Design a protein around this ligand. Structure first.
Ligand SMILES: Cc1cc2nc3c(=O)[nH]c(=O)nc-3n(C[C@H](O)[C@H](O)[C@H](O)COP(=O)(O)O)c2cc1C
Ligand code: SF4
Ligand code: SF4
Ligand code: SF4
Ligand code: FES
Ligand code: FES
Ligand SMILES: [Ca+2]
Ligand SMILES: [Mn+2]
Ligand SMILES: [Mn+2]
Ligand SMILES: [Mn+2]
Lengths: 178, 127, 238, 437
């Protein structure tokens, strides 16, 4: 996998010391993900050899974090914030609707192969709850029941997310409710 | 309630799908553990349908890609659980009246189970 | 040397000493799961807690005696209701998700977890005694699984000390075992299937319970039933 | 006016969040046009390293990571001159619920952070610096790497700064989704390519941190603040806030309030001020508020609470404590049992698994109690265990996370114990009101 792109390797090993190579495990793992959607056990063996350690040591490290998926994930992996602050905004309800509409649990993927779901912890935009982070790009904040369905059909008709039109308005570091 | 008995009834069937998918896709089905409330039940009565509390679908190496379990007869908040070991994904199937086996709101049918087991098999199984 | 006073007994002992060693050195005792002769000590199981006085100025929180150094003129209490209540509690947190295999488990009467439970747990508060508080679904996972033709792994019994993974890294130097997920969900596992190193049988004698057992000798007799013959191994010059 | 700064004063000056929300705030051009690396240049030719530490000792800057520690005294622990490589680490892993102040300094005024770290490294003789941001903060990550590049272009980073024989470079390192990675010592492991458990501290980070080396770790907010401080004197800085809580603070507020968000106010200002004047007051009846982070114990919605100066002391001697300045208001319409049913199943998730009392303790037992009792399968005995549990945990785990979990539950029993008893004794589930639009 990394044979292809060794410009990425020189560059990212160069941020850490000679004796600080495992450091690379995180950024490498991270790539595989944003490229292939999930990490296969062949990637873990590679990365181990690349970074200079055992398959065992890398395996553990990667299974420690929440973002790395180790089974396939639909085109748009919907990560929903469940933590308190978003709870008081409607998070649980939104999860019940979303999951019940699409008919998927965390480990599954919709039949049409573009929708995975996951509950996550505070995304750190509590002032704009309920919050949703798509794949690895800017949150979709203030997911009202209506704001949501539009997000859904936007992606469902192949609109690249960075330019779907969302009803209503949502502030920056401060947010006014009505 | 009497749900407890129908939940255990549903534990048998989930196990049934496990053994099926297992022989079917030719992958090891492994009885992982029996109910200690059977092994150590003495003269005491026992009416449960099986004696198997933890089941699994393992690969060639024997490392499982699917794990299944239901809670004993004497423990509280009985749920039946599905876990993809190594991929951090846990499920919790309850039992609703009339509806049936649910993971909250979505029914857990043979089909849906087979879907998960497949996804898991292709993705996780080492050999 | 430095002067320490354990409970009612005072002892000489070199500067670098672990309070745990100083404690045992006066002829006392304390629960002790994650630490092992010849391994890096870390307070991880949180069993070896003592109370420490250092001027008598009791420190506010309880110390892991196994990773605490000894200071000149220090007092160590290992018997207080504060100590013992804490111990019995820590024994309870351990046995919380454990499987219930003792009769069937090959770790028989030689199991540190068993011995430490009957020693320091079930605390006497001052009729019918309560044996188990936790009444939920215990942790259920992968069971009776061989790592190599010499080593068989019960993950349900593992108490998450670090005895094994620590050792592989430190003593022979072959990192072929580590934990996996996190939370209550973490477990021991491998990716180097064979169990590569030629020093992999040692984890067998360290593992404080019957997670990591010698498969060469599975299901033969209970540990007390064995007659033990101390000798030397002549397979080579060492 | 006459003496000290503690409010909507007219003599208070916005410094950090000054240009946040301002269009194009993150160009090296914007930062320069508003007097960019002016302070950093000054300091490097004029004040020595030791001198730039006393100006922070005197400023009275306490850590904004939630820790609270004296960050002038913190730099004071670093090895003077040993010849070893030293490391400075910005901790932009901001994962503690209800807290989001770091985020926007990262997205909209990154060069402020950069300048602030140049000063910081300079004080502690760290030539190299790292930024561990959460791998969820996407835009933040992209705006830092962006800025780090523009700075490096124009000579603000690397080689030999300002003509002065100091050199300093930054490196970004994204995370992968783990609250525990926020802990200063678990962060180092995480970065170092290991599984992020916290380390044994008897050997301290100042004397052995990143790769054995003398490292110093600070919060984003802490560092961004090192600039105004060095720009316009400690005296300016100290002239804000209480007698132990100097300077200004990034307070943010969330919950069913009128206009949630971040509001830069000085240290001392009251909850009543934030909740009302700025946030526009509640929209529902409130029953409690969580002062600092989620890790801080909840306080009842009382006047005597509303009038408390949000501080590292007024809060301290008020049951709770000031964490991250992330308040959250909780509506009566929701059960406090549920509030923590939640918060603790948050901590249950995030536990690293190293300790019996946290792994088994809270992640096992605790989250399971709330479950039972929160479904109305609860008995009176259940509320008593939960209570008796907390002190077997809090005292002694390997790291603070364990306390972070018990504290909010302790402080919830201590003000709403009847609310737990209520659900139990009537076998009633927590109320499920409609909360989202
Ligand atoms: C369990 C735990 C989790 C923490 N998580 C974070 C975090 O996510 N972000 C953060 O800035 N600090 C977090 N901290 C506090 C860090 O130790 C703090 O960020 C670090 O002290 C930075 O130094 P400063 O306070 O001087 O700025 C956490 C602390 C603990 C004990
Ligand atoms: S490891 Fe020890 S406590 Fe566990 S089943 Fe075996 S003998 Fe019993
Ligand atoms: S397998 Fe045994 S030695 Fe290894 S961590 Fe688990 S209990 Fe300790
Ligand atoms: S207290 Fe919790 S998060 Fe912290 S070291 Fe222990 S198990 Fe890990
Ligand atoms: S609670 Fe959802 S973003 Fe903080
Ligand atoms: S023996 Fe000291 S903590 Fe495990
Ligand atoms: Ca197996
Ligand atoms: Mn998560
Ligand atoms: Mn029975
Ligand atoms: Mn077997």
């Amino acid at each position: 996998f990394f044979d292809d792109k060794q410009d990425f390797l020189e560059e990212t090993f160069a941020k850490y010391p000679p004796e600080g190579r495992r450091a690379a495990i995180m950024p490498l793992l991270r790539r595989v993900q944003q490229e292939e959607g999930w990490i296969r056990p062949e990637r873990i063996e590679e990365i181990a050899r690349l970074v200079g350690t055992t398959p065992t040591e890398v395996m553990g490290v990667a299974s420690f974090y929440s973002y790395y998926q180790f089974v396939p994930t639909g085109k748009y992996h919907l990560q929903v914030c469940a933590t308190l602050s978003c709870k008081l905004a409607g998070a649980e309800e939104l999860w019940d609707y979303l999951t019940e509409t699409l008919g998927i649990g965390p480990g599954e993927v919709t039949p049409d192969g573009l929708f995975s779901v996951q509950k996550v912890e505070c995304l750190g935009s509590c002032h704009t709850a309920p919050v949703i982070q798509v794949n690895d790009e800017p949150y979709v904040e203030c997911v009202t029941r209506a704001r949501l369905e539009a997000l859904l059909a936007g992606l469902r008709a192949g609109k690249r997310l960075e330019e779907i039109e969302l009803p209503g308005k949502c502030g920056h570091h401060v947010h006014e409710v009505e | 309630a009497s749900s407890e008995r129908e939940l255990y009834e549903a534990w048998v069937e989930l196990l049934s799908w496990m053994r099926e998918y297992a022989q079917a896709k030719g992958v090891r089905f492994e009885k992982e553990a029996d109910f200690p409330d059977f092994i150590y039940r003495m003269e005491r009565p026992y009416d449960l349908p099986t004696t198997i509390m933890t089941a699994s679908l393992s690969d060639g190496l024997g490392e499982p890609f699917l794990l299944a379990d239901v809670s004993p007869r004497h423990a509280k908040l009985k749920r039946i659980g599905l876990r993809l070991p190594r991929a951090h994904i846990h499920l919790h199937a309850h039992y609703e009246p009339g509806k049936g086996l649910v993971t909250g709101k979505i029914p857990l049918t043979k089909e849906r189970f087979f879907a998960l087991a497949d996804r898991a098999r292709e993705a996780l199984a080492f050999a | 040397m430095v002067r320490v006073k354990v409970n009612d007994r005072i002892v000489e002992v070199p500067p670098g000493t672990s309070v745990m060693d100083a404690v045992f050195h006066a002829g006392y005792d304390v629960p002790l799961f994650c630490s092992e002769k010849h391994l890096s000590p870390i307070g991880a199981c949180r069993m070896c807690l003592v109370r420490i006085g250092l001027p008598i100025q009791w420190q506010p929180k309880l110390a892991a005696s196994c990773v605490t150094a000894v200071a000149d003129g220090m007092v160590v209490d290992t018997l207080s209701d504060v100590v013992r209540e804490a111990q019995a509690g820590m024994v309870e947190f351990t046995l919380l998700n454990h499987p219930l295999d003792c009769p069937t488990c090959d770790k028989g009467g030689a199991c540190e977890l068993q011995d430490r439970t009957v020693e320091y747990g079930l605390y006497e508060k001052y009729e019918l005694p309560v044996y188990t508080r936790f009444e939920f679904t215990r942790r259920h996972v992968d069971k009776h699984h061989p790592l190599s033709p010499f080593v068989i792994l019960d993950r349900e019994r593992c108490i998450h000390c670090k005895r094994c993974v620590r050792y592989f890294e430190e003593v022979p130097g072959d990192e072929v075992l580590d934990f996996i997920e996190r939370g209550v969900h973490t477990f021991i596992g491998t990716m180097d299937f064979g169990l590569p190193s030629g020093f992999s049988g040692n984890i067998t004698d360290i593992c404080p319970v019957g997670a990591l057992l010698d498969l060469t000798a599975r299901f033969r007799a209970r540990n007390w039933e064995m007659e033990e013959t101390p000798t030397t191994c002549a397979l080579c010059p060492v | 006016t006459g003496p000290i700064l503690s409010g909507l004063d007219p003599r208070f000056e916005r410094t950090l969040y000054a240009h946040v929300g301002k269009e194009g705030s993150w160009t090296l051009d914007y930062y320069l046009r508003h007097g960019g690396y002016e302070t950093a240049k000054r300091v490097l030719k004029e004040k020595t390293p030791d001198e730039v530490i006393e100006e922070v000792k005197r400023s009275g800057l306490r850590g904004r990571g939630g820790a609270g520690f004296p960050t002038g005294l913190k730099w004071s622990f670093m090895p003077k001159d040993d010849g070893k490589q030293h490391y400075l680490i910005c901790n932009a892993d901001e994962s503690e619920p209800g807290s989001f102040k770091d985020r926007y300094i990262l997205e909209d005024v990154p060069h402020l952070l950069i300048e602030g770290m140049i000063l910081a490294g300079y004080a502690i003789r760290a030539t190299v610096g790292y930024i561990y941001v959460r791998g969820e903060y996407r835009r933040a990550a992209d705006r830092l790497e962006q800025a780090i590049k523009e700075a490096r272009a124009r000579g603000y980073l690397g080689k030999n700064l300002f003509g002065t024989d100091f050199s300093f470079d930054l490196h970004v390192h994204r995370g992968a989704g783990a609250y525990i990675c926020g802990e200063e010592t678990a962060l180092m492991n995480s970065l170092e390519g290991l599984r992020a458990n916290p380390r044994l501290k008897p050997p301290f980070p100042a004397q052995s941190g990143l790769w054995g080396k003398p490292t110093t770790i600070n919060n984003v907010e802490t560092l961004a603040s090192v600039v105004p401080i060095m720009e316009r004197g400690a005296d300016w800085f100290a002239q804000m806030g209480t007698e132990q809580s100097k300077g200004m603070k990034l307070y943010q507020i969330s919950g069913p309030v009128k206009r949630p968000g971040v509001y830069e106010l000085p240290m001392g200002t009251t909850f009543r001020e934030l909740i009302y004047e700025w946030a526009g007051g509640p929209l529902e009846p409130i029953q409690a508020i969580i002062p600092g982070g989620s890790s801080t114990p909840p306080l009842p919605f009382t006047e005597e609470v509303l009038d408390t100066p949000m501080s590292y002391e007024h809060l301290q001697a008020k049951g709770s404590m000031l964490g991250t300045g992330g308040v959250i208001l909780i509506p009566e319409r929701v059960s406090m049992v549920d509030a923590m049913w939640n918060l603790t199943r948050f901590y249950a998730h995030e536990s690293c698994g190293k300790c019996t009392p946290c792994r088994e303790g809270v992640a096992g037992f605790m989250v399971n109690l709330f479950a039972k009792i929160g479904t109305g399968q609860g008995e009176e005995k259940d509320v008593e265990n939960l209570e008796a549990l907390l002190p077997l945990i809090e005292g002694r785990s390997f790291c603070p996370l364990a306390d972070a979990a018990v504290w909010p539950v302790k402080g919830s029993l201590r003000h709403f114990k009847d609310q737990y008893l209520a659900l139990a004794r009537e076998k009633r589930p927590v109320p499920r009101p409609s909360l989202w639009r």
